Amino acid sequence: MVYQVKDQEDFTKQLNEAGNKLVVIDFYATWCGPCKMIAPKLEELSQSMSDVVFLKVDVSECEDIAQDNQIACMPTFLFMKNGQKLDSLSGANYDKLLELVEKNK
Template sequence: MESQAQLQKFRVLRVESEESWEFFLSQAKDQSCPVVVHFTASWCAPSIAMKHFFEELALNFQDILFLLVDVDEVKGVASKMEVKAMPTFIFFNGANQVDKIVGANPDEIKRRVASFAQSFRAHS
């Protein structure tokens, strides 16, 4: 059980810098891997509440790369992606943004991630 909990922690990759952001997106593009990014902040209760949910999504959709960006730690990425409210979830196909959800709405996020995964599988 403990190893599953550890695996869960590592399914969502934390973006530590603008360089790691570029690296993750570049790798995803090169490998034709879809990406879902959770923009969060330590002071935002809805964002914090969504972290566990996001980790569960990552376990259920293992063909998608899930990234976590703290907007206060990686301000340049948040600014470049025009993130103005937390939580914000952005979907990428390659280097292209294809969807964006602002707010903590687990049902809508899960529906869109499932649809995103299905559409990506259909085109692979």
């Protein structure tokens, strides 16, 4: 399952709970058509990659988190591991997302 971040406290807790796992953070908005289309694909991916943590951030409800990460395009996937940003993908391209999870996990 992809965990919906409520706020900064929740986000920080999830990042700490991930330990040394790759974290994929889906920054999305409900006005973003492709975000809603890729969402079910991300849910399935989170079931098949148990070693990866999948989070989602509704930028309309978590504006501070969005701007801290200089998000511009919907969706944006951030790839994090051990507190470092490794990669970023703008757009709802699932095949590229899968490629980046391999390049980085």
